[PDB]
């Protein structure tokens, strides 16, 4: 489930006019047309931050796994953080980060190497050359893993109590028995076949890692969101090479070629084209951000139900009678283990 998109803060003035005083003056003649654009993009950024908060910060306190890891025979090492790894994530978490490639990290401060790029500057250096930057998300990919681990330790050591009030410790076989009792089957059968269910659980957890490893793209939704944002930004930057029916497509040589009171018409033509393209981009970003907001609200509800408890609604928390759900952080999204 996608949770967020890349936050953008396109500067209309910079995008429509490059450090050109006459162009900015003639842009001022369009009124507060694009202050709306800056406001909308700021709203999108804040909404994405709130989406991440709603999806993930569902706990009241930070929780930690017991130093020993023996959950009645259940093997979970594949979802609790790994101390040895510097990022303190899980094998699944890393697979997810290793199978999603971000065009623009944003938290790079890439200024300073466009000049050391040597070869043609990358899309990022080019976007920087025409005022389209990417703000980084407020929650980093590291403490988001901390939130995921807190949620995970809340479920496996306290059952669903910690989703309501104080976290009450309960043995994992017992939580299994109670979830089983939640779907209409007694707890005795679990205690009878606790070994068999533990082996099946371990096998399923092991085989999901290979399922994500060998598939070309099972992360199609997150990669689709990232590709959509990158492609929108690329289409945004590409319109700066479009003449829009004028003498040329560059403000700097247009001003340097025509005197002010004839270059006015050409500059106004560029302003009309570029503002229209920017409005297209902002409206599409608004629509996609509303879609992502709906998806993230669905993700937050799914977390609050499947994670912090057992959900009786059939086929909501994955196919079959729901028992638990283990969340995992993903680049600009969340991944559940129902």
């Amino acid at each position: 489930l996608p949770v967020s998109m890349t936050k953008t803060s396109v500067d209309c003035t910079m995008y429509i006019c490059g450090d050109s005083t006459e162009c900015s003056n003639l842009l001022l003649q369009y009124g507060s047309f694009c202050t709306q654009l800056k406001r909308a993009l700021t709203g999108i950024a804040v909404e994405q931050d709130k989406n991440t908060q709603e999806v993930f910060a569902q706990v009241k306190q930070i929780y930690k796994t017991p130093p020993i890891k023996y959950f009645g025979g259940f093997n979970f090492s594949q979802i609790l953080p790994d101390p040895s790894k510097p990022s303190k994530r899980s094998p699944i978490e890393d697979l997810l980060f290793n199978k999603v490639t971000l065009a623009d990290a944003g938290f790079i401060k890439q200024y300073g190497d466009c000049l050391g790029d040597i070869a043609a500057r990358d899309l990022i250096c080019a976007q920087k050359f025409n005022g389209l930057t990417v703000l980084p998300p407020l929650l980093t990919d590291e403490m988001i893993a901390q939130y995921t681990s807190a949620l995970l330790a809340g479920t496996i050591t306290s059952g669903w109590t910690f989703g309501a009030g104080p976290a009450l410790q309960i043995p994992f076989p017992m939580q299994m028995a109670y979830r089983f009792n939640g779907i209409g089957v007694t707890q005795n059968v679990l205690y009878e076949n606790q070994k068999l269910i533990a082996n099946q659980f371990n096998s399923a957890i092991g085989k999901i890692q290979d399922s994500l490893f060998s598939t070309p793209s099972a992360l199609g939704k997150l990669q689709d969101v990232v590709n959509h944002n990158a492609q929108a930004l690329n289409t945004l930057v590409k319109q700066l090479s479009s003449k829009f029916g004028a003498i040329s497509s560059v403000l700097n040589d247009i001003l340097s070629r025509l005197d002010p009171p004839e270059a006015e018409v050409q500059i106004d033509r560029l302003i009309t084209g570029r503002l229209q393209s920017l409005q297209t981009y902002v409206t599409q970003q608004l629509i996609r951000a509303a879609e992502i907001r709906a998806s993230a609200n669905l993700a937050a509800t799914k977390m609050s139900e499947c994670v912090l408890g057992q959900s009786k609604r059939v086929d909501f928390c994955g196919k079959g009678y729901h028992l638990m759900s283990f969340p995992q952080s993903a680049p600009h999204g969340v991944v559940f283990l129902h």
Binding site: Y111, T133, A167
Partner: protein, 621 residues
């Protein structure tokens, strides 16, 4: 209402040269001056404006008296002390009510202050004034509006500024206004209670951006920051040889229009002052580059088409225009991008007994394609006769352009030549002068490389350009690498210094201390730029070495970093939040604490069961 204005306003906390009196220095006048004076009864009468203050340029005298005023616009010389010495050709003698209102409550302690503001935008001299009784001392600091008194359109340069004094038997407060944006608070009775200069403090820019005197606690993106260039390397190729426009103009046999001679100008340096001094111009309608920027542009190839015509035909020939000369002799492309030249030549295309040497075509089978010659002698067909000859319905295509020294101007022999620039981007050859400055490989610079103007930085580039690659570019159509025209070495062009400035402030009511966060830019870059005074932000956030935090969302200035952790108060980005915390009060930045560190005592047979319960009524909106 909180109306925002952009006009010439005295900056807040500027520099005012306080004077004294006991000789009357002339002060410069620029974008208006702010004048203020406090006095017992009167020691100052008026002011003198203009230039050179002599009997050569008109000057202004604003001398008052206790009765009226004597504003006038005349060319007086100097009194050196009568005041209207050699009035001279005068103008605008104005008389009205006195500007100087003085009142006392039966005592002289009421040293009223008189603040005057004069400015001279587009002529139309404006004068503003206001009289307020003293409460304590000089340049008091309380707010005070200024009302206009007289708006008389003098319409003369004013650049010097001087004042008069008094006689018979602690003032002179002068300030210089600047073009600034102001946000002014209006009161219910139409009166100005408070004003804030947006270009002053980060808090000032924040309150101004949201046009409200009260900024609630939060972070507000207000503007952007860019490092203005220091200096500018303009370097062109390494040629100097002068172009032959002298021939093109110091010829005699300029082609008839039916066969327009066309030269090519390349591999040379174009300084069109020779083109200027070789012709008493009659029409210089450029259809390509302005003559002003003509010497600042480079052309791959330049085509000079010489063809003598007449005043009517001079206007007739133009980018894709009609007319037999334009449709059957010489045609300009509809998108023609070049300068046309036309000067009168009655001395080379005229003689006694006449001269019918020139030619032009009126009869062609079709229109003339742009830049296409149609030299041919074929008799136009009329009706359906294959007739070949002169006379009836068999007409010669081309008729004489006969010239004599005595015609009308519209029939005079205008000599027309044209420079059809290409302004493409292929390796340039005709570059104008401009002088090559040296290189500066590491400092942001305005560049004018071969007509291509722009701004950025230049660093070494291994880009293995094959020996034919020139302008160069990147992925999304933005010039990235220009080979130095003279050293052939390859130069990457980097953005200047852009990111964005957001001001983090607590409630103005709680506190006014502000913290600035430059977005996605290192403090080191900002520091060397703040230190070099090349940053466009005129608000200089204070730096004490302890207020610098290189974060992942750029750099935060004005807030120290406390290696503790609290619930987030103001989200900044990348896991750091700023808040107003006691020390006695300042702004601190910290890594947000996700919550209380709690450990659960899980174990194979330990369970926790609530022996009691509570009820709680939350709310959802």
């Amino acid at each position: 209402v909180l109306h925002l204005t952009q006009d010439l306003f005295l900056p807040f906390f500027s520099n005012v040269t306080w004077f004294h009196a006991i000789d009357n220095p002339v002060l410069p006048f620029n974008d208006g001056v702010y004048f203020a004076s406090t006095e017992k009864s009167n020691i100052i009468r008026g002011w003198i404006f203009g230039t050179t203050l002599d009997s050569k340029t008109q000057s202004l005298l604003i001398v008052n008296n206790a009765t009226n005023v004597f504003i006038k616009v005349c060319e007086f010389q100097f009194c050196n002390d009568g005041v209207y010495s050699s009035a001279n050709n005068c103008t605008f003698e104005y008389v009205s009510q006195p500007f100087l209102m003085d009142l006392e409550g039966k005592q002289g302690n009421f040293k009223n202050l008189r603040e005057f503001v004069f400015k001279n935008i587009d002529g139309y001299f404006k004068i503003y004034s206001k009289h307020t009784p003293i409460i304590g001392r000089d340049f008091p600091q309380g707010f005070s509006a200024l009302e206009p008194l007289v708006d008389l359109p003098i319409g003369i340069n004013i650049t010097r500024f001087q004042t008069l004094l008094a006689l018979n038997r602690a003032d002179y407060y002068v300030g210089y206004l600047q073009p600034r944006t102001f946000l002014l608070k209006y009161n219910e009775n139409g009166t100005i209670t408070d004003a804030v200069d947006c270009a002053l403090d980060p808090l000032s820019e924040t309150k101004c951006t949201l046009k409200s005197f009260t900024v609630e606690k939060g972070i507000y993106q207000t503007s952007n920051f860019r490092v203005q260039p220091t200096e500018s390397i303009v370097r062109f190729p390494n040629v100097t040889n002068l172009c032959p426009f002298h021939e093109v103009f110091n010829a005699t046999r300029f082609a008839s229009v039916y066969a327009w001679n066309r030269t090519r100008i390349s591999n040379c340096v174009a300084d069109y002052s020779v083109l200027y001094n070789f012709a008493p111009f009659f029409a210089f309608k450029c259809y390509g580059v302005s003559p002003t920027k003509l010497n600042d542009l480079c052309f791959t190839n330049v085509y000079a088409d010489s063809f003598v015509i007449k005043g009517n035909e001079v206007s007739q020939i133009a980018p894709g225009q009609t007319g037999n000369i334009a449709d059957y002799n010489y045609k300009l492309p509809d998108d023609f991008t070049g300068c046309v030249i036309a000067w009168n030549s009655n001395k080379l295309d005229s003689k006694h007994s006449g001269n019918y040497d020139y030619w032009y075509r009126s009869f062609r089978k079709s229109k003339l394609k742009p830049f296409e010659r149609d030299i041919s002698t074929e008799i136009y067909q009329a009706g359906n006769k294959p007739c070949k000859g002169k006379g009836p319905n068999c007409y010669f295509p081309l008729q004489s352009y006969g010239f004599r020294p005595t015609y009308g101007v519209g029939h005079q022999p205008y000599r027309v030549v044209v420079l059809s620039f290409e302004l493409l981007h292929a390796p340039a050859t005709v570059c104008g002068p401009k002088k090559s400055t040296n290189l500066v490989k590491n400092k942001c610079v305005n560049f004018n490389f071969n007509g291509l103007t722009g701004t950025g930085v230049l660093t070494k580039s291994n880009k293995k350009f094959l020996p034919f690659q020139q302008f160069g570019r990147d992925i999304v159509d933005t010039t990235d690498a220009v080979r130095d025209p003279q050293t052939l070495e390859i130069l990457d062009i980097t953005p200047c210094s852009f990111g964005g400035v957001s001001v983090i402030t607590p409630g103005t009511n709680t506190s006014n201390q502000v913290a600035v966060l430059y977005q996605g830019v290192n403090c080191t870059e900002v520091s060397v730029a703040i230190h070099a005074d090349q940053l466009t932000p005129t608000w200089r956030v204070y730096s004490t070495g302890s207020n610098v935090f290189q974060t992942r969302a750029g750099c935060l200035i004005g807030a120290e970093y406390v290696n503790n952790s609290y619930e987030c108060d103001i989200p900044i980005g990348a896991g750091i939040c700023a808040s107003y915390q006691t020390q006695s009060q300042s702004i601190i930045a910290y890594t947000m604490s996700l919550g209380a560190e709690n450990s659960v005592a899980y174990s194979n047979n330990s369970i926790a069961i609530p022996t009691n319960f509570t009820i709680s009524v939350t709310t959802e909106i």
